[PDB]
Amino acid sequence: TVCEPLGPDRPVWFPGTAPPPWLDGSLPGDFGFDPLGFGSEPESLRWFAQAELMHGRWAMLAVAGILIPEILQKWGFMEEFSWYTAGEREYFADPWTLFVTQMALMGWVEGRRWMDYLNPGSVDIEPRFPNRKNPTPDVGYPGGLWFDWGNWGRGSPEPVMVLRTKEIKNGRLAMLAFVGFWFQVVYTGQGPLDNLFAHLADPGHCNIFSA
Amino acid sequence: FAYPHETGNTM
Amino acid sequence: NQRDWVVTKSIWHLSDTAIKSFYTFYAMFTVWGVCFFASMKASMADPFYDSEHYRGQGGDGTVHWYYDRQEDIEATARGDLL
Amino acid sequence: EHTYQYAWVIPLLPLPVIMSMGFGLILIPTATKNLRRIWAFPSVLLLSIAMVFSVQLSIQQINGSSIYQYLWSWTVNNDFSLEFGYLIDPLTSIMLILITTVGILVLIYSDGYMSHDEGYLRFFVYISFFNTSMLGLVTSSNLIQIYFFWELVGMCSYLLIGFWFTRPIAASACQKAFVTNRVGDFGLLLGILGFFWITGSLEFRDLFQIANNWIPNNGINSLLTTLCAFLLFLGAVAKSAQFPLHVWLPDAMEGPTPISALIHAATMVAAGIFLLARLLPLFISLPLIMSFISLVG
Amino acid sequence: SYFPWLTILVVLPIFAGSLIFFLPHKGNKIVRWYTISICLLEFLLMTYAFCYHFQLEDPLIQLKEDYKWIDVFDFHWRLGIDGLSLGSILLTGFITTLATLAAWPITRNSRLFYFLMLAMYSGQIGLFSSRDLLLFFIMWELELIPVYLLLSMWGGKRRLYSATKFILYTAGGSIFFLIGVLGMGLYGSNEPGLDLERLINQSYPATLEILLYFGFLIAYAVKLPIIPLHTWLPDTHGEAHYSTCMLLAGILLKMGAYGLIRINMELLPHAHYLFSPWLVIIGAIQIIYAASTSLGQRNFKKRIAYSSVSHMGFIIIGIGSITNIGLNGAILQILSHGFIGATLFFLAGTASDRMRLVYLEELGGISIPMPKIFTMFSSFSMASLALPGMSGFVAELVVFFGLITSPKFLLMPKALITFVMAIGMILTPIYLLSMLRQMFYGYKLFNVPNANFVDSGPRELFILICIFLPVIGIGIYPDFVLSLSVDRVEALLSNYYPK
Amino acid sequence: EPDLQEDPIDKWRTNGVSPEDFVYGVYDGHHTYDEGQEKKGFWEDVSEWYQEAEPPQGFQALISWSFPPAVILGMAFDVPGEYLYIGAAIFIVVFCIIEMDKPDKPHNFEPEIYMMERSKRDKLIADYNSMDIWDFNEKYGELWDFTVN
Amino acid sequence: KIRNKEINNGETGTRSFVKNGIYMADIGPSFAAHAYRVRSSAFDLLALEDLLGKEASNYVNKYLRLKATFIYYDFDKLITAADPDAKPPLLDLANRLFDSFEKLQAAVTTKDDTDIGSCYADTKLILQEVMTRM
Ligand code: CLA
Ligand SMILES: CC(/C=C/C=C(C)/C=C/[C@@]12O[C@]1(C)C[C@@H](O)CC2(C)C)=C\C=C\C=C(C)\C=C\C=C(C)\C=C\[C@@]12O[C@]1(C)C[C@@H](O)CC2(C)C
Ligand SMILES: CC1=C[C@H](O)CC(C)(C)[C@H]1/C=C/C(C)=C/C=C/C(C)=C/C=C/C=C(C)/C=C/C=C(C)/C=C/C1=C(C)C[C@H](O)CC1(C)C
Ligand SMILES: CC1=C(/C=C/C(C)=C/C=C\C(C)=C\C=C\C=C(C)\C=C\C=C(C)\C=C\C2=C(C)CCCC2(C)C)C(C)(C)CCC1
């Protein structure tokens, strides 16, 4: 736990501006950007931090699942066609069965996680053979060799706050990427790589303003 | 007087 | 091409092609004319061949200089003369 | 599926890391040895791709297909050509899965194991090199080009046995663990040259056909085709640990434990069994060898 | 084209080194740079002549020219490059430039030394580019004094005995060569006779073919070590400075093979075709005898010398067993050995002079103080093990293929000789790793004091890397040294007459 | 010169010149169970390791660094070979006349002259590097004349 | 140092592109071990003009010779071991092929670009038919 208070250690998102006082910069990925001041009170602050982390991780997974199969279609062996139209793809089972199974299992898991949030340490999975003392928690970073078997979130590979900063920044970027992909498919009728190459060929004209 | 406690979280 | 061998125990078929560097065997020798860049890695400092823990520069000098023994016998003779 | 003309990137997939560490390990020894744990990620990831590029290469074979192979002439000189390339048949995909899975797992186990040690990066380089050599051996079209990888995995196993290179036993076991499979590859090369002279070709598509059906009568070669195959069998024996050549495995276990788990389930079994299993089309015409194999087993 | 290249390429080194004399400037400094610049200029001119003034598609001679020199016994400045010569010429320029670089920290004389280096340079290129038999002999014996001086001035403890044995032995060996010169020079001297190109059509009578063949073969077996004529090598290799020994055991040995290819197989076919099988037998037994006596030695310099001896059996067996590839795989072998043996002697001479212990029993754990030497030494040991990937493999493989598909054999020795040859692969690691294990592995005393123990600096490391990279580049795709279309005419003469 | 003598002759093939692996005075304490974690980053470590040679100093660096990105580009937007082999030619000359015109250091000269009474300084530095051809101090006739103050 | 036993492929001035000194292992006299190596060799000269069709065809006349000598010898060994009836048309086939090979070699020896391909078209058309009459 390292703090990033005002000064050179605090590169303000808006140069020449004093960041909101209740934005200390402890949470990695902070730059003093909350003009709406939603993080005014601490309970809301931590709640929004958890929401941000979850959104970032899910958005990373979603953008990977969009990107990789489409390029492996374009040039790779197997041809995974339009992902936006894969939502209605036909499988062995009906979409509602898939939906209810997803909801059951994810409700189980996310409910256990919800109780962990409301009551830290009271719902954890970390066995204890004798004489080896286990690690604690920092909710949002469960620890133990279930979700950190590489021993990366604790020390050695990088000071923690730096790696969490990497994570939150990449997650914000991935959120932008997902909303961009979706909005493009709303407007255009291709995948992300197709729009990409179309822009590469004609950067000067092949844009949103092409029509 | 020590004891064979568990190994790391990666093995 | 893509000949299709029906072997007597399995389900083969193959496809082959012949390739060889046309004349770039000249261009690779020209690029390996980078030994004319053996001058930046020679003007660099020598590891210890210039170190103070070295005096004598032959191929057996430092190793078989080793005849200060004769000079020491001569110094013994001189000290006896003293 | 047409996902074959891009499959050749399998045995070359981790390579873009190896050369990018050894250089650093030789030119700049005090910088790469300070990015210690980070270097684990670009490897365990890259090899991982290979695995997910192999199941889709194997699932196809499960659904029923036909095996492919690609040949390229890497020598056109006076009087005779030399080929290289690979093939993807059921056995290839089997051993491919079996090598990449245990590889991607032992990499993480090694990251856990060798964390207090000093030769972290060198260890990872050796592991990745052995892995990209074994992945090469299992996918290989003609005999000469499998011999090219046999001795490579032999040298990798050598460098891995005497890893710490300072325990005065690990310095006396690597030598034996090299000379034994050296005798093995000696027998392998003699058998290869014998079959070459007898049939005139090197690749399986022609060797299996010629050697089985068309061959002259007892111009003495019959004794040769009985003998030469015994030499290939001797090589496949020596890479594994059978009766006459087994004195290198017990002491070879002196090396580090992850290597002791990768040279007893990944190469010890593959380079031994796999070759015999692939050359089985030859040995059905030699009942003597069919009995001698069972006897030594 | 008529602007003479080979004349320049032969008279540039010795001339531009003659200016070292009559130049009072310093003790050691300026001479090193003035010599390395000349060496690099010569190498660049060599590669410029090769690239845009050569064809690779015609088996005649290129860039030839001649003059009138003594005119009584017809002996001209006749000079010309050809397919067989080109590889050895390039290898000589390369490895001798790198040897002159490796000779950087020599301050004992440093004026006679670099001049003698340039003289040996010019002599090697003169021989490898010769086109007139007497001029070939002149270039052959011209280098005999410079090498003796380099031996007797720098290198080893017992330099004198080695140097005198070497010089006497080589000078005596060249006597039979001069005998052959006098023999085939007087055979119808009106027909040019001393023009190595116009001798392809000579039809000598019987019982004279054999005598000239043997007069050349004895001299060659003297230069290129053959079993009963090898006793000189361990002394003149275990006592030479590594700078000398690099070019010595990487070029000067291969002259004995280049000459045997050029003047025996090209000029005296029915004197060589009735003598090939015994050459093959001798090479086959040499491959194992050299290794079996290498394992016995105890100072690693002589062990490296014997390892260099052993690989000279593949060249022999490739000269016999008359095929296109058997002769052609020999050239790749002389290149891939001029690399490996030279580098191994450089590494041996660089590890030593840091430890001052020659007997392989007291060498402790040198891996702890100096890692990079250990790495670049194990790598080239692997190369010498005929390990695949590196260029020490494909040469031996093509040699095997040449022996197997030979026409002058019917399956009886074509297999036993292959067997006795393959025993070399079982035998060589037994004596290479036995050195790698005694001298490097194990934990010696706490050799913490960083004095008289420093890893290779930039110069030596760059030399090692710059010689290593060609090995990989050739062993991965060997056809960077199969630019030889003379064998399609070299093995054209022999291929139908009797027997 | 004392050079004490030797002792009960050792195995010809002594397995590894080492202490026999009984008193190997730590297993795993000499190579593996050893490391911690201290300091020093990456880039300030690289650009503190390319400067333990002062490899070039000034102009002699510009002509040595901008050369490879001019002889790798050369194999593109192709230019005739003659141009390419006079480029490398004029390099090997310009780089040479700057090297041989650098000062001299004590380790360069003879062994018998390397070991003076620390009057080597004013005999070589600012004495050799301040003249062209004077040979007033021509003491390369070794009998220990030393011909200096 | 090797002879032929059916002298009808030798055209006027009986010779060809052939490069003697190539080792061809014994396969036994049969119209099954020759119609197979002839196929698996005539398969290569299809794959010849894939990469080395253009781009400095100075190795093409170093590999066509090689992988056509096999055809030239094995086709004779075959045309011997056949019944009287199938011999005239197989021989006619032989004639058109081993003339197109000489034509192709002589055209590629000139280091052209379009003449090489135009001539190779014919030996491909004929040589794709050799892999069927077997
Ligand atoms: C990571 C952010 C990102 C990137 C790299 C792209 C890239 C692209 N978009 Mg896009 N887009 C984005 C976000 C992004 N978008 C978002 C958030 C939306 C929702 C409003 C859209 C909606 C959208 C539509 C409707 C269309 C594109 C299209 C395109 C392509 C042509 C460029 C163009 O005309 O659109 C320019 C894109 C915008 C004006 C969107 C503005 C929003 C982004 C975030 C701008 C901010 C820049 C970013 C933060 C800085 C770079 C970050 C990183 C990449 C280095 C191009 C590949 C077109 C297409 O399909 O290609 C043929 C098209 O028709 N975009
Ligand atoms: C961008 C985003 C939210 C951004 C919010 C921002 C910036 C708020 C910023 C502010 O508050 C601050 C910071 C400070 C305030 O003072 C100022 C403002 C400005 C008010 C969420 C994206 C969130 C993105 C999310 C949650 C991604 C969800 C992923 C899904 C649904 C997966 C879908 C798929 O799985 C299917 C359905 C089928 C597969 O075939 C395809 C895939 C894609 C794999
Ligand atoms: C828009 C657009 C448009 C156009 O068209 C084009 C373009 C430009 C391309 C586009 C863009 C896009 C983008 C931006 C994207 C991004 C993404 C991301 C960031 C992702 C992440 C992503 C991320 C990710 C995946 C991550 C992940 C992670 C993970 C799993 C981890 C795991 C782990 C853990 C926990 C722990 C343990 O012990 C170990 C490990 C293993 C370590
Ligand atoms: C791969 C894939 C994917 C995904 C996947 C997933 C997402 C999964 C998830 C999830 C899951 C997978 C889940 C599951 C869950 C659940 C669980 C895991 C449960 C458990 C339970 C239990 C354990 C219980 C117990 C009990 C009982 C019963 C008795 C009483 C008591 C108790 C409670 C204890 C993606 C992206 C899509 C796409 C592609 C494919």
TrEMBL record, chain A:
Residues engaged in binding chlorophyll b 2: 52
Binding site for chlorophyll a 1: 31, 33, 52, 55, 166-167, 170, 172, 184, 199
GO cellular component: chloroplast thylakoid membrane; photosystem I; photosystem II
Signal peptide: none
Membrane topology: Multi-pass membrane protein
Binding, chlorophyll b 1: 57
Annotated coiled-coil segments of the chain: none
One annotated GO biological process: photosynthesis, light harvesting in photosystem I
Principal place of residence: plastid
UniProt family annotation: Belongs to the light-harvesting chlorophyll a/b-binding (LHC) protein family.
Protein name, entry field: Chlorophyll a-b binding protein, chloroplastic
Source organism of the structure: Hordeum vulgare subsp. vulgare
Residue numbers of the full-length protein present here: 56 to 266 of 270
TrEMBL record, chain B:
Described function: NDH shuttles electrons from NAD(P)H:plastoquinone, via FMN and iron-sulfur (Fe-S) centers, to quinones in the photosynthetic chain and possibly in a chloroplast respiratory chain. The immediate electron acceptor for the enzyme in this species is believed to be plastoquinone. Couples the redox reaction to proton translocation, and thus conserves the redox energy in a proton gradient.
Family assignment from sequence similarity: Belongs to the complex I subunit 5 family.
Stretch of the intact protein here: 573 to 583 of 781
Cell compartments where the protein resides: Plastid, Chloroplast thylakoid membrane
The protein's name: NAD(P)H-quinone oxidoreductase subunit 5, chloroplastic
Gene it is expressed from: ndhF
Organism expressing this protein natively: Hordeum vulgare
Subunit structure: NDH is composed of at least 16 different subunits, 5 of which are encoded in the nucleus.
Automatic annotation (TrEMBL), chain E:
A GO CC term attached to the entry: chloroplast thylakoid membrane
UniProt family annotation: Belongs to the complex I subunit 4 family.
Protein name per UniProt: NAD(P)H-quinone oxidoreductase chain 4, chloroplastic
Membrane topology of the entry: Multi-pass membrane protein
One example of a Gene Ontology biological process annotation: ATP synthesis coupled electron transport
Annotated catalysed reactions: a plastoquinone + NADPH + (n+1) H(+)(in) = a plastoquinol + NADP(+) + n H(+)(out); a plastoquinone + NADH + (n+1) H(+)(in) = a plastoquinol + NAD(+) + n H(+)(out)
Transmembrane intervals: 5-23, 30-50, 84-104, 111-128, 134-154, 166-190, 210-233, 240-261, 273-292, 304-325, 331-352, 373-404, 416-436, 461-478
Family annotation (InterPro entries): NADH_Q_OxRdtase_chain4, NADH_Q_OxRdtase_chainM/4, NADH_UbQ_OxRdtase, ND/Mrp_TM
Compartment annotation: Plastid, Chloroplast thylakoid membrane
Residues in NADH:quinone oxidoreductase/Mrp antiporter transmembrane domain copies: 130-412
Provenance organism: Hordeum vulgare subsp. spontaneum (Wild barley)
Keyword line: Chloroplast, Membrane, NAD, NADP, Plastid, Plastoquinone, Quinone, Thylakoid, Translocase, Transmembrane, Transmembrane helix
Name of the coding gene: ndhD
TrEMBL record, chain F:
GO cellular component terms, A-Z: chloroplast
GO biological process: response to oxidative stress
Claim: Cytoplasm is one of the keywords in the record: no
Residue ranges of the TM segments: 83-100
Keywords: Membrane, Transmembrane, Transmembrane helix
The protein's name in its UniProt record: Predicted protein
Organism of this sequence: Hordeum vulgare subsp. vulgare
Lineage: Eukaryota, Viridiplantae, Streptophyta, Embryophyta, Tracheophyta
